[PDB]
Design a protein around this ligand. Structure first.
Ligand SMILES: *[C@@H]1O[C@H](CO)[C@@H](O)[C@H](O)[C@H]1NC(C)=O
Ligand SMILES: *[C@@H]1O[C@H](CO)[C@@H](O)[C@H](O)[C@H]1NC(C)=O
Ligand SMILES: *[C@@H]1O[C@H](CO)[C@@H](O)[C@H](O)[C@H]1NC(C)=O
Ligand SMILES: *[C@@H]1O[C@H](CO)[C@@H](O)[C@H](O)[C@H]1NC(C)=O
Ligand SMILES: *[C@@H]1O[C@H](CO)[C@@H](O)[C@H](O)[C@H]1NC(C)=O
Ligand SMILES: *[C@@H]1O[C@H](CO)[C@@H](O)[C@H](O)[C@H]1NC(C)=O
Ligand SMILES: *[C@@H]1O[C@H](CO)[C@@H](O)[C@H](O)[C@H]1NC(C)=O
Lengths: 100, 294, 27, 49, 100
């Protein structure tokens, strides 16, 4: 029986995994060894502490992360969702629209 | 196994009040300019902690065997590095494993396996006054280790690394928490500028290392490093001087705390939530500086 | 100064003091 | 309050959809997803009212 | 009028993991020539290595192989902290009782 548990001890190496490249300033999909999310990973300006990996904010959501290999701090940001609106003079005069 | 130092005279324990001490980072998560409430084991504010001390003026061979219920906040102040590594266990008769720690200059050796102790555990080094050099002489704290399971060696510990007598400038804080078969140790090494007792200041404790064993520890004791000199002739068991030593011992209880983070991500202020009606009001309001009103 | 704000309006605006984007929220 | 209501088990294995989806197969993760759906829907309804 | 919502889809699928070339020793767990008693059940901690997960599933046949809380096919990408290994020999009739 292989015995393991989650959220019982902080980890930095964990179990098996492979490594790929790193990209920034693009809304990409990432998985930093158990930390899964989607966003834009710009270079961070915050000052961390040597034992202090993650980062959060008031609402307790991820806002920064440390590189497992190069040990540098880079931000996380959702990639610009929003809504659209259609402006029309009416079908009755014309048919052009303007999308906002 | 080992010698049995005399003068085992009883003495009532002393007491002193802990002034906002024993706060550690509960997890490796960065937070900035936020107030976070945690539900974890902590040292309650404004409790009286014991004041074991060893002084030649009897000889005050004071290192009794002390309980380990849930955690122990250990705070030892000195300057001659008289203190040494700690020691743990449940029965201390080699039937069950017992954790050992030594913080000498070489390395932080950690022994977890079984080994039988002697009835009066003690560490002593016979310094040679003929040679202008200091070396370890005697190592007698256990009989032998028949079988062993786990071992661990880390980087050499951070000490003052200087042997002299002077003003009290060194303060050592340690938290010994073990839960779910996981042994954790925290520390801080802040200096002091006042002679005696806990200074009226606040400082947080950062994590050091995690030791996964799975052993049950219920029993606690402290090792002491003692130097024997020629200034006290006679039997080798009594021909020694211990200088001045002091260490405080507290206890940990399940209490809810409120933590204040600065913009370096360091805890600068904490508020207990079960001490005072005003403290409970602060905890409920999730802020400081409560104004008028019921 | 800002063209149409009188001194009392300026005092009122400075006296009143109060928002990162989240999942689904918009203003 | 509405934002902080997101991180709640609501009597499920976990409060994050990704963990449930990756760690569990659909046929028995459906109940956990339904529980989270009900909880978040109720919270949003109360906020709107 | 408002019609729909606008979202930016992810582009890449980057993933990172510190490069540790150590292979986790499954040999003394799943291929040990000697086994211990049930009362003295073995427990070895596994860390600081990459677990060769694939070979254990695609090259070995197990009469009983069931997973609780984690999908067996998703075990490839999920890593854990302080993986434990238990080795013991028990009666075949009592194997079913080893479950939460
Ligand atoms: C606009 O459309 C309506 C039908 O929806 C039509 O009855 C009306 O006559 C149109 N406008 C004008 C100015 O005729
Ligand atoms: C005193 O200590 C010695 C060695 O430390 C031990 O052999 C002896 O049994 C002890 N005497 C007691 C426990 O009465
Ligand atoms: C101080 O310590 C002694 C013994 O523990 C006793 O007077 C009392 O319990 C303590 N006082 C406070 C305020 O905790
Ligand atoms: C010492 O530990 C080993 C390892 O399990 C065990 O086989 C042996 O019986 C133990 N010896 C004693 C005296 O308990
Ligand atoms: C630890 O706790 C268990 C369960 O309460 C108890 O049986 C055991 O005697 C304790 N001590 C050791 C060394 O296991
Ligand atoms: C936070 O850290 C920076 C980096 O040195 C420092 O300049 C700043 O003073 C720190 N914040 C405070 C409140 O001291
Ligand atoms: C990756 O490999 C390098 C080889 O130069 C070595 O430092 C170590 O094994 C790994 N380093 C890190 C930071 O993971």
């Amino acid at each position: 029986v292989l015995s393991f548990e989650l959220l019982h001890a902080p980890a930095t190496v964990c179990g098996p995994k492979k490594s790929t490249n790193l990209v920034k300033n693009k809304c990409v999909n990432f998985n930093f060894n158990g930390l899964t999310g989607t966003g834009v990973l710009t270079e961070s300006n915050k000052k961390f502490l040597p034992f202090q990996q993650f980062g959060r904010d008031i609402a307790d959501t991820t806002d920064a992360v440390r590189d497992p290999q190069t040990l540098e701090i880079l931000d996380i940001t959702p990639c610009s969702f929003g809504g659209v609106s259609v402006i029309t003079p009416g079908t009755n005069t014309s048919n052009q629209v303007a999308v906002l | 196994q080992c010698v049995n130092l005399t003068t085992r005279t009883q003495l009532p324990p002393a007491y002193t009040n802990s002034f906002t001490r024993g706060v550690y980072y509960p997890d490796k998560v960065f937070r900035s300019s936020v107030l976070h409430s945690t539900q974890d084991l902590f040292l309650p504010f404004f409790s009286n902690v014991t004041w074991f001390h060893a002084i030649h003026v009897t000889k005050r061979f004071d290192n009794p065997v002390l309980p380990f219920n849930d955690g122990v906040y250990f705070a030892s102040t000195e300057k001659s590095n008289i203190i040494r590594g700690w020691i743990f266990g449940t029965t201390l008769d080699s039937k069950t494993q017992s954790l050992l720690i030594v913080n000498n200059a070489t390395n932080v050796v950690i022994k977890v396996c079984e080994f039988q102790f002697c009835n009066d555990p003690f560490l002593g080094v016979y310094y040679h006054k003929n040679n202008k050099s200091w070396m370890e002489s005697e190592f007698r704290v256990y009989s032998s280790a028949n079988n062993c399971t786990f071992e661990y060696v880390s980087q050499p510990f951070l000490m003052d690394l200087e042997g002299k007598q002077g003003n009290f400038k060194n303060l050592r804080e340690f938290v010994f928490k073990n839960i779910d078969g996981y042994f954790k140790i925290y520390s801080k090494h802040t200096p002091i500028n006042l002679v005696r007792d806990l200074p009226q200041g606040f400082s947080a404790l950062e994590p050091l290392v995690d030791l996964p064993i799975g052993i049950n520890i219920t029993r606690f004791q402290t090792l002491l490093a003692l130097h024997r000199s020629y200034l006290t002739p006679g039997d080798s068991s009594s021909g020694w001087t211990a200088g001045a030593a002091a260490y405080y011992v507290g206890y940990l209880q399940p209490r809810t705390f409120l933590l204040k983070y600065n913009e370096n991500g360091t805890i600068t202020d904490a508020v207990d939530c079960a001490l005072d009606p005003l403290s409970e009001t602060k905890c409920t309001l999730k802020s400081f500086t409560v104004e008028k009103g019921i | 100064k800002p063209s149409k704000r009188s001194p009392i309006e300026d005092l009122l605006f400075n006296k009143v003091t109060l928002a990162q984007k989240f999942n689904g929220l918009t203003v | 309050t509405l934002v902080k209501q997101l991180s709640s088990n609501f009597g499920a294995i976990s409060s994050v959809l990704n963990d449930i989806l990756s760690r569990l197969d659909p046929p028995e993760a459906e109940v956990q997803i339904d529980r989270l759906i009900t909880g978040r829907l109720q919270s949003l309804q109360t906020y709107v009212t | 009028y408002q019609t729909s919502n606008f979202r930016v889809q992810p582009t890449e699928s980057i993933v990172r993991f510190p490069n540790i070339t150590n292979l986790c020793p499954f040999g003394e767990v799943f291929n040990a020539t000697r086994f211990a008693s049930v009362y003295a059940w073995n427990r070895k901690r596994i860390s600081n290595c990459v677990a060769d997960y694939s070979v254990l599933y695609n090259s070995a046949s197990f009469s009983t192989f069931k997973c609780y809380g984690v999908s067996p096919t998703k075990l490839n990408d999920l890593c854990f902290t302080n993986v434990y290994a238990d080795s013991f020999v028990i009666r075949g009739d009592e194997v079913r009782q080893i479950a939460p």
